[PDB]
Amino acid sequence: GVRTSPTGEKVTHTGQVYDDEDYRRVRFVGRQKEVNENFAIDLIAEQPVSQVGSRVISCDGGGGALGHPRVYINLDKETKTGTCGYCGLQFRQQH
Protein backbone atom coordinates (compact mmCIF):
# COMPACT_ATOMS: atom_id res chain seq x y z
CA GLY A 1 0.00 0.00 0.00
CA VAL A 2 2.70 2.47 -0.98
CA ARG A 3 1.77 6.08 -1.76
CA THR A 4 3.51 8.43 -4.19
CA SER A 5 4.07 12.13 -3.61
CA PRO A 6 3.36 14.66 -6.41
CA THR A 7 7.12 14.86 -7.06
CA GLY A 8 7.08 11.16 -8.02
CA GLU A 9 8.94 9.94 -4.93
CA LYS A 10 7.25 7.21 -2.91
CA VAL A 11 6.35 7.47 0.78
CA THR A 12 7.46 4.84 3.28
CA HIS A 13 5.37 3.54 6.18
CA THR A 14 7.01 6.09 8.50
CA GLY A 15 5.58 8.94 6.43
CA GLN A 16 8.99 10.24 5.35
CA VAL A 17 9.21 11.92 1.95
CA TYR A 18 11.26 14.76 0.48
CA ASP A 19 9.83 18.16 -0.38
CA ASP A 20 10.04 19.67 -3.85
CA GLU A 21 12.55 22.31 -2.72
CA ASP A 22 14.71 19.80 -0.83
CA TYR A 23 18.23 19.48 -2.23
CA ARG A 24 18.61 15.99 -0.75
CA ARG A 25 16.63 14.46 -3.63
CA VAL A 26 19.81 14.57 -5.74
CA ARG A 27 20.99 11.33 -4.11
CA PHE A 28 18.17 9.54 -5.97
CA VAL A 29 19.02 10.99 -9.39
CA GLY A 30 20.25 8.19 -11.62
CA ARG A 31 19.44 5.68 -8.86
CA GLN A 32 16.38 4.53 -6.94
CA LYS A 33 14.89 4.96 -3.48
CA GLU A 34 14.74 1.70 -1.54
CA VAL A 35 11.23 1.49 -0.07
CA ASN A 36 9.56 -1.62 1.37
CA GLU A 37 6.03 -1.99 0.00
CA ASN A 38 4.80 -4.60 2.51
CA PHE A 39 3.35 -2.18 5.06
CA ALA A 40 2.91 -4.05 8.34
CA ILE A 41 -0.08 -2.00 9.54
CA ASP A 42 -2.25 -3.07 6.59
CA LEU A 43 -1.24 -6.72 6.96
CA ILE A 44 -1.96 -6.79 10.69
CA ALA A 45 -5.28 -5.01 10.09
CA GLU A 46 -6.41 -7.92 7.88
CA GLN A 47 -6.07 -10.55 10.61
CA PRO A 48 -9.43 -11.90 11.82
CA VAL A 49 -10.36 -11.24 15.44
CA SER A 50 -10.25 -14.42 17.52
CA GLN A 51 -13.41 -15.09 19.53
CA VAL A 52 -12.72 -16.84 22.84
CA GLY A 53 -14.79 -17.89 25.83
CA SER A 54 -12.88 -16.58 28.85
CA ARG A 55 -12.40 -13.27 30.62
CA VAL A 56 -8.61 -13.47 30.19
CA ILE A 57 -6.49 -14.87 27.37
CA SER A 58 -2.79 -15.54 26.81
CA CYS A 59 -0.75 -14.63 23.74
CA ASP A 60 2.71 -15.82 22.74
CA GLY A 61 2.83 -15.01 19.01
CA GLY A 62 2.61 -18.61 17.87
CA GLY A 63 5.48 -21.08 17.99
CA GLY A 64 6.20 -20.84 21.71
CA ALA A 65 9.85 -19.92 22.19
CA LEU A 66 9.92 -18.60 18.60
CA GLY A 67 7.46 -15.85 19.54
CA HIS A 68 7.21 -12.98 22.01
CA PRO A 69 7.02 -13.27 25.82
CA ARG A 70 3.68 -14.69 26.92
CA VAL A 71 1.34 -11.85 27.86
CA TYR A 72 -2.15 -11.93 29.37
CA ILE A 73 -5.00 -9.85 27.93
CA ASN A 74 -8.20 -8.86 29.74
CA LEU A 75 -11.51 -9.00 27.88
CA ASP A 76 -13.85 -7.19 30.28
CA LYS A 77 -14.64 -4.42 27.76
CA GLU A 78 -17.57 -5.13 25.46
CA THR A 79 -16.76 -2.10 23.29
CA LYS A 80 -13.20 -2.78 22.11
CA THR A 81 -11.14 -5.87 21.35
CA GLY A 82 -8.17 -6.90 23.44
CA THR A 83 -5.06 -6.29 21.35
CA CYS A 84 -1.80 -8.04 22.16
CA GLY A 85 0.98 -5.58 22.88
CA TYR A 86 3.65 -7.42 20.90
CA CYS A 87 2.12 -9.16 17.87
CA GLY A 88 -0.94 -6.93 17.51
CA LEU A 89 -3.46 -9.77 17.37
CA GLN A 90 -6.86 -8.84 18.81
CA PHE A 91 -9.08 -11.22 20.78
CA ARG A 92 -12.69 -10.80 21.83
CA GLN A 93 -14.97 -12.44 24.37
CA GLN A 94 -18.12 -13.88 22.82
CA HIS A 95 -20.36 -12.47 25.58
Partner: protein, 340 residues
Protein backbone atom coordinates in the same frame (compact mmCIF):
# COMPACT_ATOMS: atom_id res chain seq x y z
CA UNK B 1 14.91 29.49 2.71
CA UNK B 2 15.05 25.75 3.34
CA UNK B 3 15.91 24.22 6.71
CA UNK B 4 18.53 21.86 5.25
CA UNK B 5 20.50 24.66 3.53
CA UNK B 6 21.08 26.63 6.75
CA UNK B 7 24.81 26.39 7.61
CA UNK B 8 25.86 24.28 10.57
CA UNK B 9 29.03 23.14 12.26
CA UNK B 10 32.46 24.74 12.41
CA UNK B 11 33.24 24.62 8.69
CA UNK B 12 35.02 21.27 8.86
CA UNK B 13 34.75 18.14 6.77
CA UNK B 14 31.49 16.91 8.33
CA UNK B 15 29.93 20.38 8.66
CA UNK B 16 27.17 21.83 6.47
CA UNK B 17 28.16 24.92 4.51
CA UNK B 18 24.80 25.37 2.78
CA UNK B 19 26.36 25.35 -0.69
CA UNK B 20 24.96 23.03 -3.35
CA UNK B 21 27.35 23.41 -6.28
CA UNK B 22 27.36 21.81 -9.72
CA UNK B 23 30.90 22.08 -11.11
CA UNK B 24 31.23 21.32 -14.82
CA UNK B 25 34.45 19.78 -16.05
CA UNK B 26 35.61 18.99 -12.52
CA UNK B 27 37.94 16.19 -13.66
CA UNK B 28 40.39 18.66 -15.20
CA UNK B 29 42.92 21.07 -13.68
CA UNK B 30 41.00 23.76 -11.80
CA UNK B 31 38.25 21.28 -10.97
CA UNK B 32 40.45 19.25 -8.62
CA UNK B 33 41.32 22.29 -6.50
CA UNK B 34 37.78 23.68 -6.61
CA UNK B 35 36.19 20.38 -5.52
CA UNK B 36 38.86 20.03 -2.83
CA UNK B 37 38.14 23.50 -1.45
CA UNK B 38 34.37 22.98 -1.66
CA UNK B 39 34.44 19.59 0.06
CA UNK B 40 36.57 20.67 3.01
CA UNK B 41 33.91 23.13 4.22
CA UNK B 42 31.17 20.51 3.97
CA UNK B 43 29.35 21.34 0.74
CA UNK B 44 27.11 19.23 -1.47
CA UNK B 45 29.10 18.90 -4.70
CA UNK B 46 27.63 17.49 -7.91
CA UNK B 47 30.16 16.23 -10.46
CA UNK B 48 28.87 15.54 -13.99
CA UNK B 49 31.58 13.58 -15.77
CA UNK B 50 32.07 12.58 -19.41
CA UNK B 51 35.19 10.43 -18.96
CA UNK B 52 35.78 7.16 -17.13
CA UNK B 53 34.85 6.93 -13.44
CA UNK B 54 38.45 5.76 -13.00
CA UNK B 55 39.44 9.35 -13.78
CA UNK B 56 36.98 10.47 -11.08
CA UNK B 57 38.65 8.14 -8.57
CA UNK B 58 41.03 10.92 -7.53
CA UNK B 59 38.05 13.22 -6.95
CA UNK B 60 36.32 10.60 -4.79
CA UNK B 61 38.17 11.09 -1.44
CA UNK B 62 37.90 14.90 -1.58
CA UNK B 63 34.73 15.17 0.53
CA UNK B 64 32.58 13.45 3.12
CA UNK B 65 30.02 10.67 2.68
CA UNK B 66 27.25 11.52 0.25
CA UNK B 67 28.60 15.01 -0.40
CA UNK B 68 29.91 14.28 -3.91
CA UNK B 69 27.37 12.94 -6.41
CA UNK B 70 28.81 11.66 -9.70
CA UNK B 71 26.61 11.44 -12.77
CA UNK B 72 26.95 11.28 -16.54
CA UNK B 73 26.31 14.17 -18.90
CA UNK B 74 26.85 15.21 -22.50
CA UNK B 75 27.71 18.60 -23.92
CA UNK B 76 25.09 18.39 -26.68
CA UNK B 77 22.26 17.09 -24.47
CA UNK B 78 20.40 19.83 -22.60
CA UNK B 79 18.28 17.28 -20.73
CA UNK B 80 21.34 15.88 -18.95
CA UNK B 81 22.27 19.40 -17.84
CA UNK B 82 18.68 19.93 -16.67
CA UNK B 83 19.05 16.73 -14.66
CA UNK B 84 22.35 17.95 -13.19
CA UNK B 85 21.40 21.51 -12.20
CA UNK B 86 17.77 21.06 -11.10
CA UNK B 87 18.71 20.80 -7.41
CA UNK B 88 21.86 22.94 -7.25
CA UNK B 89 21.99 26.55 -6.12
CA UNK B 90 25.44 27.47 -7.49
CA UNK B 91 26.64 26.46 -10.96
CA UNK B 92 30.33 26.75 -11.89
CA UNK B 93 31.47 26.48 -15.51
CA UNK B 94 35.07 25.38 -16.13
CA UNK B 95 34.55 23.57 -19.45
CA UNK B 96 37.42 24.10 -21.85
CA UNK B 97 40.08 22.44 -23.94
CA UNK B 98 43.48 23.57 -25.20
CA UNK B 99 42.91 22.04 -28.66
CA UNK B 100 40.10 21.17 -31.05
CA UNK B 101 39.45 17.48 -31.70
CA UNK B 102 37.57 15.47 -34.32
CA UNK B 103 34.30 15.76 -32.37
CA UNK B 104 34.45 19.17 -30.65
CA UNK B 105 35.88 22.36 -32.12
CA UNK B 106 36.62 25.53 -30.16
CA UNK B 107 33.11 26.87 -30.83
CA UNK B 108 31.49 23.83 -29.21
CA UNK B 109 33.54 23.88 -25.99
CA UNK B 110 33.70 27.68 -25.72
CA UNK B 111 30.35 28.98 -27.04
CA UNK B 112 27.71 26.25 -27.35
CA UNK B 113 28.17 24.34 -24.07
CA UNK B 114 28.48 27.45 -21.80
CA UNK B 115 25.40 28.99 -23.43
CA UNK B 116 23.42 25.77 -22.98
CA UNK B 117 24.55 25.43 -19.35
CA UNK B 118 23.69 29.05 -18.55
CA UNK B 119 20.31 28.80 -20.30
CA UNK B 120 19.28 25.66 -18.43
CA UNK B 121 20.56 27.13 -15.16
CA UNK B 122 18.42 30.23 -15.71
CA UNK B 123 15.45 28.02 -16.60
CA UNK B 124 15.98 25.93 -13.44
CA UNK B 125 16.10 28.96 -11.14
CA UNK B 126 19.75 28.80 -10.09
CA UNK B 127 20.62 32.03 -8.29
CA UNK B 128 24.41 31.99 -8.77
CA UNK B 129 26.12 31.15 -12.06
CA UNK B 130 29.88 31.50 -12.55
CA UNK B 131 31.72 31.29 -15.88
CA UNK B 132 35.51 30.99 -16.23
CA UNK B 133 36.70 32.95 -19.29
CA UNK B 134 40.23 34.07 -20.23
CA UNK B 135 41.81 37.43 -19.42
CA UNK B 136 43.04 38.10 -22.97
CA UNK B 137 39.69 37.23 -24.60
CA UNK B 138 39.57 39.42 -27.70
CA UNK B 139 37.23 39.40 -30.68
CA UNK B 140 40.17 40.48 -32.89
CA UNK B 141 42.68 38.01 -31.43
CA UNK B 142 44.88 35.93 -33.71
CA UNK B 143 44.12 32.48 -32.27
CA UNK B 144 40.70 30.85 -32.24
CA UNK B 145 40.99 30.22 -28.48
CA UNK B 146 40.64 33.84 -27.42
CA UNK B 147 38.09 34.69 -30.13
CA UNK B 148 35.82 31.82 -29.09
CA UNK B 149 36.31 32.64 -25.40
CA UNK B 150 35.27 36.26 -25.98
CA UNK B 151 32.21 35.21 -28.00
CA UNK B 152 31.18 32.65 -25.37
CA UNK B 153 31.66 35.14 -22.54
CA UNK B 154 29.42 37.62 -24.35
CA UNK B 155 26.80 34.91 -24.94
CA UNK B 156 26.86 33.89 -21.26
CA UNK B 157 26.55 37.52 -20.13
CA UNK B 158 23.67 38.14 -22.54
CA UNK B 159 21.81 34.97 -21.50
CA UNK B 160 22.46 35.19 -17.73
CA UNK B 161 22.32 38.82 -16.54
CA UNK B 162 23.36 37.81 -13.00
CA UNK B 163 26.33 35.66 -14.03
CA UNK B 164 29.77 36.22 -12.51
CA UNK B 165 32.55 36.02 -15.11
CA UNK B 166 36.08 35.31 -13.87
CA UNK B 167 39.00 36.01 -16.22
CA UNK B 168 42.30 34.48 -15.06
CA UNK B 169 45.53 35.40 -16.80
CA UNK B 170 47.61 32.21 -16.68
CA UNK B 171 47.56 29.47 -14.05
CA UNK B 172 50.70 27.82 -12.71
CA UNK B 173 50.48 24.82 -10.42
CA UNK B 174 51.55 21.25 -9.81
CA UNK B 175 49.54 19.81 -12.72
CA UNK B 176 49.54 22.89 -14.93
CA UNK B 177 50.36 23.22 -18.62
CA UNK B 178 52.21 26.55 -18.35
CA UNK B 179 55.38 25.96 -16.32
CA UNK B 180 55.36 22.25 -17.20
CA UNK B 181 55.26 23.15 -20.90
CA UNK B 182 58.37 25.32 -20.53
CA UNK B 183 60.13 22.71 -18.40
CA UNK B 184 59.33 19.97 -20.94
CA UNK B 185 60.28 21.93 -24.08
CA UNK B 186 63.96 21.27 -23.17
CA UNK B 187 63.62 17.74 -24.61
CA UNK B 188 63.28 19.04 -28.17
CA UNK B 189 66.24 21.43 -28.17
CA UNK B 190 66.99 24.90 -26.85
CA UNK B 191 63.65 26.64 -26.10
CA UNK B 192 62.84 28.67 -29.24
CA UNK B 193 60.98 31.95 -28.78
CA UNK B 194 59.57 34.73 -30.94
CA UNK B 195 61.85 37.81 -31.04
CA UNK B 196 63.82 36.25 -28.14
CA UNK B 197 60.66 36.43 -26.01
CA UNK B 198 61.34 40.01 -24.90
CA UNK B 199 58.29 41.63 -26.51
CA UNK B 200 55.58 39.80 -24.52
CA UNK B 201 54.65 40.36 -20.87
CA UNK B 202 53.04 37.72 -18.65
CA UNK B 203 51.59 37.88 -15.13
CA UNK B 204 50.78 34.32 -14.04
CA UNK B 205 48.54 33.60 -11.05
CA UNK B 206 48.70 30.73 -8.56
CA UNK B 207 45.99 28.07 -8.72
CA UNK B 208 45.16 28.15 -4.99
CA UNK B 209 44.55 31.91 -5.12
CA UNK B 210 42.20 31.43 -8.08
CA UNK B 211 40.33 28.76 -6.11
CA UNK B 212 40.07 31.05 -3.07
CA UNK B 213 38.78 33.84 -5.30
CA UNK B 214 36.15 31.51 -6.77
CA UNK B 215 35.03 30.40 -3.29
CA UNK B 216 34.85 34.00 -2.06
CA UNK B 217 32.90 34.98 -5.18
CA UNK B 218 30.46 32.18 -4.34
CA UNK B 219 30.08 33.49 -0.79
CA UNK B 220 30.07 37.22 -1.62
CA UNK B 221 26.60 38.57 -2.50
CA UNK B 222 28.12 41.59 -4.28
CA UNK B 223 29.97 39.49 -6.87
CA UNK B 224 26.72 38.85 -8.78
CA UNK B 225 27.04 40.54 -12.16
CA UNK B 226 30.69 41.52 -11.73
CA UNK B 227 33.48 40.65 -14.18
CA UNK B 228 36.70 39.99 -12.27
CA UNK B 229 40.24 39.79 -13.64
CA UNK B 230 42.48 37.42 -11.67
CA UNK B 231 46.13 38.31 -12.31
CA UNK B 232 49.34 37.71 -10.42
CA UNK B 233 51.21 40.24 -8.31
CA UNK B 234 54.19 40.61 -10.66
CA UNK B 235 54.72 41.10 -14.39
CA UNK B 236 57.59 39.36 -16.19
CA UNK B 237 58.82 39.37 -19.74
CA UNK B 238 58.75 35.96 -21.37
CA UNK B 239 62.53 35.65 -21.78
CA UNK B 240 63.49 36.00 -18.12
CA UNK B 241 60.40 34.00 -17.11
CA UNK B 242 61.65 31.01 -19.11
CA UNK B 243 65.14 31.77 -17.76
CA UNK B 244 63.84 31.57 -14.19
CA UNK B 245 61.98 28.35 -15.00
CA UNK B 246 65.16 26.74 -16.34
CA UNK B 247 67.22 28.13 -13.45
CA UNK B 248 64.79 26.56 -10.99
CA UNK B 249 65.00 23.25 -12.86
CA UNK B 250 68.83 23.64 -13.00
CA UNK B 251 68.72 22.84 -16.72
CA UNK B 252 71.01 24.29 -19.41
CA UNK B 253 69.39 27.39 -20.91
CA UNK B 254 70.37 28.17 -24.52
CA UNK B 255 67.62 30.27 -26.14
CA UNK B 256 67.53 31.01 -29.86
CA UNK B 257 65.17 33.16 -31.94
CA UNK B 258 62.52 31.73 -34.23
CA UNK B 259 60.44 33.63 -36.81
CA UNK B 260 56.68 33.80 -36.41
CA UNK B 261 55.98 31.99 -39.68
CA UNK B 262 58.50 29.28 -38.79
CA UNK B 263 56.92 28.65 -35.38
CA UNK B 264 53.44 28.17 -36.86
CA UNK B 265 54.71 25.39 -39.13
CA UNK B 266 56.28 23.72 -36.09
CA UNK B 267 52.96 23.93 -34.26
CA UNK B 268 51.25 22.44 -37.31
CA UNK B 269 53.48 19.36 -37.12
CA UNK B 270 52.81 18.68 -33.43
CA UNK B 271 49.02 19.02 -33.64
CA UNK B 272 48.34 16.14 -36.06
CA UNK B 273 48.71 13.55 -33.29
CA UNK B 274 45.51 11.58 -32.53
CA UNK B 275 46.38 11.76 -28.82
CA UNK B 276 46.73 15.01 -26.91
CA UNK B 277 49.10 17.23 -28.94
CA UNK B 278 52.26 18.47 -27.27
CA UNK B 279 51.78 21.92 -28.79
CA UNK B 280 49.68 23.65 -31.43
CA UNK B 281 49.51 26.97 -33.26
CA UNK B 282 46.87 28.24 -30.82
CA UNK B 283 49.16 27.41 -27.89
CA UNK B 284 51.97 29.16 -29.77
CA UNK B 285 49.93 32.34 -30.28
CA UNK B 286 48.72 32.35 -26.68
CA UNK B 287 52.24 31.76 -25.33
CA UNK B 288 53.54 34.84 -27.19
CA UNK B 289 50.60 37.14 -26.41
CA UNK B 290 51.04 39.99 -23.94
CA UNK B 291 48.64 39.91 -21.00
CA UNK B 292 46.48 43.03 -21.18
CA UNK B 293 45.90 45.34 -18.23
CA UNK B 294 42.30 46.10 -17.19
CA UNK B 295 42.40 48.50 -14.22
CA UNK B 296 38.63 49.06 -14.43
CA UNK B 297 37.90 45.47 -13.43
CA UNK B 298 38.12 44.24 -9.83
CA UNK B 299 40.84 41.74 -9.02
CA UNK B 300 41.83 39.23 -6.35
CA UNK B 301 42.39 42.04 -3.83
CA UNK B 302 38.69 42.95 -3.96
CA UNK B 303 37.78 39.40 -2.87
CA UNK B 304 40.19 39.37 0.07
CA UNK B 305 42.73 37.05 -1.59
CA UNK B 306 46.38 38.05 -1.25
CA UNK B 307 48.30 37.20 -4.42
CA UNK B 308 51.27 34.86 -3.90
CA UNK B 309 54.26 35.44 -6.20
CA UNK B 310 55.81 32.82 -8.46
CA UNK B 311 59.03 32.72 -6.42
CA UNK B 312 57.41 30.83 -3.53
CA UNK B 313 55.71 28.14 -5.66
CA UNK B 314 57.94 27.70 -8.73
CA UNK B 315 60.17 25.20 -6.93
CA UNK B 316 57.10 23.25 -5.81
CA UNK B 317 55.92 23.17 -9.42
CA UNK B 318 59.26 22.37 -11.07
CA UNK B 319 61.16 20.20 -8.57
CA UNK B 320 60.13 17.05 -10.44
CA UNK B 321 61.97 18.29 -13.56
CA UNK B 322 65.44 18.29 -11.96
CA UNK B 323 68.02 15.53 -12.18
CA UNK B 324 69.49 13.67 -9.20
CA UNK B 325 72.34 16.18 -8.88
CA UNK B 326 70.09 19.18 -8.18
CA UNK B 327 67.13 17.51 -6.47
CA UNK B 328 67.82 18.85 -2.96
CA UNK B 329 68.62 22.50 -3.72
CA UNK B 330 66.97 24.98 -1.38
CA UNK B 331 64.61 27.92 -1.88
CA UNK B 332 67.07 30.78 -2.07
CA UNK B 333 69.93 29.54 -4.27
CA UNK B 334 68.25 30.76 -7.46
CA UNK B 335 68.46 34.38 -8.57
CA UNK B 336 64.87 35.70 -8.76
CA UNK B 337 63.35 36.97 -11.98
CA UNK B 338 63.42 40.62 -13.04
CA UNK B 339 60.06 42.37 -13.26
CA UNK B 340 59.00 45.43 -15.27
Amino acid sequence: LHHAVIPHGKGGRSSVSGIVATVFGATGFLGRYLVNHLGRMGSQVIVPYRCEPYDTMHLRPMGDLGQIIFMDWNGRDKDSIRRAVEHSNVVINLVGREWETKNFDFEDVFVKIPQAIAQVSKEAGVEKFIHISHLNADIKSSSKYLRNKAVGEKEVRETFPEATIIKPADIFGREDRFLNYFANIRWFGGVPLISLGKKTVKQPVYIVDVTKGIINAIKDPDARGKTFAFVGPNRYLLFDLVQYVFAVAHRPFLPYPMPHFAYRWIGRLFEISPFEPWTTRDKVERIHTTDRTLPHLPGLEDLGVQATPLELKAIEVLRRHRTYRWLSSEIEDVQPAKTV
